[PDB]
Amino acid sequence: PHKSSLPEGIRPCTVLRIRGLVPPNASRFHVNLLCGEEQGSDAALHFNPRLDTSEVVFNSKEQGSWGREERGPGVPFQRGQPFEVLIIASDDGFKAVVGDAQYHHFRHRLPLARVRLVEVGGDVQLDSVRIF
Amino acid sequence: SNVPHKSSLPEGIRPCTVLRIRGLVPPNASRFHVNLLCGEEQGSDAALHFNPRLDTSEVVFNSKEQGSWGREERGPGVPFQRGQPFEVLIIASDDGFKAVVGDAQYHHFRHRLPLARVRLVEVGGDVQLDSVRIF
């Protein structure tokens, strides 16, 4: 349940560096770009590695309802293995990088200038969260 | 050692491009460089010259256009040490290049040449290169 508050939002070319360890029997974890600390706040990005189902789900949340799910190729995560993730906020969308390779491109659905908070949750052991 | 390392970038880079350079500074290194150049041709213009200097304990940013070097900028201190590995991000944005070293933003180098003119990434000097990734 890590929260990084982002007053004045994030301007494009923002890099999110997420370093951590995947627990040995972890189910799934998530990184969300939300518009506020409130519960029903809109999710500009929902990045959801799911090891139980062996997938990685991208989505957004608007007006309390989830949008269409996108999925990337395979799972660049392993139970008991560390990981580094970049989330590059561009004009065209979000570039998710895992390890040394770009994993998926999630095109914008909500205005990027609405993101007010970064939340990291789930079965993840967080080492560091940096925003450049 | 992987120097001089060259990564050719036809069709350029669009903004919000992240350059990840990882390597080791050898035990008796003097200085090394990372250049965002406009072509493989000799004496090609340098949109960015990122120049860690361990012998003089400085880090110099500059650009080169039409064969002439611009004015040098300098960052705070040297986030590099002989005998220690390093990671550097060069975030090509709309306003310029954000140089991140380790866990901290180090310096912002405003554009002097059009960002869309960069055609090559070169890494040279007293550096033992681990990887150059472009996202």
Residue B126 backbone class (left: φ over 0; alpha: ψ -120 to 50; beta: rest): beta
Nearest to A86 by CA among B16, B95, B50: B16
In contact, A88 and B100? CB cutoff 8 Å: no
Give residue limits of the domains in chain B: 1-135
What 8-state DSSP symbol labels residue B72?
P
Rounded to a whole number, what is the distance in Å from the CA of A67 to chain B's nearest CA? 26
Scanning every residue of chain B, which has its alpha carbon at the shortest distance from the alpha carbon of A19? B103
The experimental technique behind this entry is: X-ray
Residues whose CB falls within 8 Å of the CB of residue A8, separated by 6 or more in sequence, listed in order:
none
Alpha helices in A16-118 (DSSP H): none
**Would you state the structure tokens that stand for residue A49, as one six-digit string?**
């590695």
Residues of B with CB under 8 A from a CB of A: 14-16, 18, 89, 91-94, 98, 100, 103, 105, 131, 133, 135
Give the 3-state secondary structure of residue A101.
strand
Question: Environment class of residue B109 by beta-carbon count within 10 Å: exposed (0-12), middle (13-18) or buried (19+)?
Answer: buried
Question: Environment class of residue B73 by beta-carbon count within 10 Å: exposed (0-12), middle (13-18) or buried (19+)?
Answer: middle
Chosen for mutation from A13, A18, A94, A100 (greatest number of chain B CBs closer than 10 Å) is A13
Q: Is A67 annotated as a binding residue?
A: yes
Residue B77, H or E segment: none
Residue A120 backbone class (left: φ over 0; alpha: ψ -120 to 50; beta: rest): beta
